């Protein structure tokens, strides 16, 4: 890999610079190189990895949605035939998105998840696995769509099981996992009631544990709680 000659510490340093410069593709490439050194990631390093790829795939998903909407409009009655270009370019963006998702999934499988024994790391990686299978599911239309959806579900469910056993209900990783799994239920699994029940129960159980927290922990937990409330407001 092109980062094979760069020191681990230098890749991490450069990922932080790339973040400051809003160079998320570079950030992701640096973090991929750091993962490929083979050592486990610290909390801070896991956050760099996630931020980099979230921002890269986020931009691809937004572009894919713009192009998919144009394509859908082209297939309505009365729309003038304009040739294969809209489909081709949506396919191009889609293939690039799938590539990024496959890259992330590959890092998780080789070998981040299997080396992650502490609950905080294992849950974090399994949440990522669910997230990147969810992004694959968003664009899937073929023979494998059900298996892709089930891969996302399975990863999220394993993360949920660990999180409920091992982490307090206010833990930001537990909260973020539940937020995203709830979105999976609403948007991917056609299960809005499950989505709502999960968001509500997660919010309420967190609320009941806030009394245990420092001011700084309270700030972290309540920020994600508000995202749960925001989704509940959208959905009810």
């Amino acid at each position: 890999g092109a980062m094979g000659s760069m020191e681990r510490a230098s890749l991490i340093q450069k990922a932080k610079l790339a973040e400051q410069a809003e160079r998320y593709e570079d950030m992701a490439a640096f973090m991929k190189g750091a993962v490929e050194k083979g050592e486990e990631l610290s909390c801070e390093e896991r956050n760099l990895l996630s931020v980099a790829y979230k921002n890269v795939v986020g931009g691809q998903r937004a572009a894919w949605r713009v192009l998919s909407s144009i394509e859908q409009k082209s297939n309505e009655e009365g729309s003038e035939e304009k040739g294969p270009e809209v489909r081709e370019y949506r396919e191009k963006v889609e293939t690039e998105l799938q590539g990024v998702c496959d890259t992330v999934l590959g890092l998780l499988d080789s070998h981040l998840i299997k080396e992650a024994g502490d609950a905080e790391s294992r849950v974090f990686y399994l949440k990522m696995k669910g997230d990147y299978y969810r992004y694959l599911a968003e664009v899937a239309t073929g023979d494998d769509k059900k298996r892709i959806i089930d891969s996302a579900r399975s990863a999220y469910q394993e993360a949920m099981d660990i999180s409920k056993k091992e982490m307090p209900p206010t833990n930001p990783i537990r909260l973020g996992l539940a937020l995203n799994f709830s979105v999976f239920h609403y948007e991917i699994a056609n299960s809005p009631e499950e989505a709502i029940s999960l968001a509500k129960t997660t919010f309420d159980e967190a609320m009941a544990d806030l009394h245990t927290l420092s001011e700084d922990s309270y700030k972290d937990s309540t920020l994600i709680m508000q995202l749960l409330r925001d989704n509940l407001t959208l959905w009810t």
Partner: peptide, 5 residues
């Protein structure tokens, strides 16, 4: 779109 982290 709904919020995710």
């Amino acid at each position: 779109f709904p919020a995710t982290v």
